[PDB]
Write a protein that binds this ligand. Sequence first.
Ligand code: HEM
Ligand SMILES: CC1=C(/C=C/C(C)=C/C=C/C(C)=C/C=O)C(C)(C)CCC1
Length: 441
Amino acid sequence: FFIPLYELFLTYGGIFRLTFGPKSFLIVSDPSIAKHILKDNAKAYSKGILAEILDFVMGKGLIPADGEIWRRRRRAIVPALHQKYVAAMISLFGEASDRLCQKLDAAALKGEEVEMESLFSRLTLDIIGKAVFNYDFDSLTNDTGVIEAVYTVLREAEDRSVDPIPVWRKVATSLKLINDTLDDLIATCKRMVEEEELQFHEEYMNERDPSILHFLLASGDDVSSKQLRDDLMTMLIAGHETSAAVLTWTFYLLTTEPSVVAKLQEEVDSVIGDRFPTIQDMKKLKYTTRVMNESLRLYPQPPVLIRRSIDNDILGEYPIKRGEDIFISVWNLHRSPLHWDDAEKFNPERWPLDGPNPNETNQNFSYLPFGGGPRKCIGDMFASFENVVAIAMLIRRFNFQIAPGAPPVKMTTGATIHTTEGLKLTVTKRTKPLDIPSVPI
Ligand code: HEM
Ligand SMILES: CC1=C(/C=C/C(C)=C/C=C/C(C)=C/C=O)C(C)(C)CCC1
C-alpha cells in the first residue's frame, strides 16, 4: 500500500488526498505536518481507523483508545516500566536470545539453513510473554494450543489491517483460550501479591515475578478484569510482531553490507564476547544501537501511523474539517531524499557514532520509530534494548549469509512489514565449542 505512496509523495508533496471512489485518505509525508498531528495539536485527533482494526483483540487497550480512558490507563501502566524493571528485563533478553543461539548452533553444526523470520517471531513472543504477564510460551522449543491461538489472532489482525485499504470461527476460540489463560495468570499473580511483604514505591518490583502484571496488581489500581486483560493483550500484541520484524529486516540489511557486519562483529567481540549483556553494556554497544536505529529507519514498524481529525485544523497550509482519515507515512518520512543523505543506503553511521541516539525530537519528526507526542510508544526503551541484546548475541556467535536458492525477500505488509516467504540464511559458527567462554571488561 505504502510503496506507491512514496512516488506519489515525490510528485504531489507532503500532503495529498488519495481518493478511491467516494472515500479518501489524507496522506502526510511532511515532518512538520506530522509533528503538528502527533504532538503540537494531538488533541484534535483520534486513532480513527486504527481502533476499527484492533478493537476485536485489544479492546480498551492503550493503542486504540482515546479520551479519559486512554489518559487513565496510560498514567497507570507507564510506571511499571521503570529503570530497574528495564534493567531486569535485559537478563530475560539475554536468556531468551541464548535459547535461540542454541537452536542456531544445532543447525550450524549440521550445515542446515535457517528461516530467521519465524525464529525471530518465536524469540520475541517468548520474551514478551514473560515480561508482561509472567508466562513462558517457550515457542522457541514447542508448539501449544496457546501459541497457535496467538498466531491465529495475529493472522486475523493482519486481515483487518488490509481490509479498509484499497488496492490498485477459530478466531473466537483463540480469543477465549488467550483470555482464560490470562485469567489464570491474573489469579495466580493475585495470590502472590496477597502473600508478599513488599512495600510499593516508584521503583516497585518483586524480584521473583517482575512482570508488568505484577507491578500493576501490587499498585492496586483496581480496574476490571476485562480492562486488565485488554491492557495486557495490547502490550502482548505491540511488543511481539514489531521486534520480530526489526530483527528480521536487520539481518537482511546485514547481508547487504559486509562492512557493517565486520564493524559490528568487531564491537561485539570486544565489548561483550560471550557475555549476557547487562544494562551497562547498552551504552557500550554503540554500533549495535546504530544498526538497530538504521534498521528501524529503513523498515519502520508500522510503516504508517493512523489518525482521524475530530476538529478543524490546518495541515501544512490546507484547512481540513473533522472526520478526515489521516495516514502518516513513516516510510516516506524515513526515506525522504529531502531529509536523508543516500536515503536508500544501509548506513548505521549516518548519525554520529558518539553523538546522541536519534529520536523524533533531535530528528525533528523525520524519524519516528516509536511515534511521537502523547501517544508515543511506552516500550521504546524496552524494545530498543531487547533488539540490541538479540543482535549482539547472534552476531557474536554466527556468520549469516543469504541461503543459496533462497526465495526472494519481498515485503508483505499488514500491521508490520513481514516478508513474502521468509529470510532463509546459512548460519556458520564464529567461535569454537572447545573455546573457554570469553568474558571481556
Ligand atoms: C521495535 C519494537 C516496537 C516498535 C517499533 C513500536 C512502535 C510503536 C509506535 C509507533 C507506537 C505509536 C502508535 C501511534 O501513535 O498510533 C506505539 C505505541 C505503543 N506501544 Fe510500542 N512499539 C514497539 C514495542 C513495544 C513494546 C515492547 C511494548 C511493551 C509494553 C509496546 C507497547 C506500546 C503501547 C502500550 C503503545 C500505546 C501507547 C499509547 O497509545 O499511549 N510497544 N508503539
Ligand atoms: C499502532 C501500532 C501497531 C499497529 C499498527 C497497525 C494496525 C498498522 C496498520 C497499517 C496499515 C493499514 C498499513 C497499510 O499499508 C502495532 C504494530 C500492533 C504495535 C505498535 C504500534
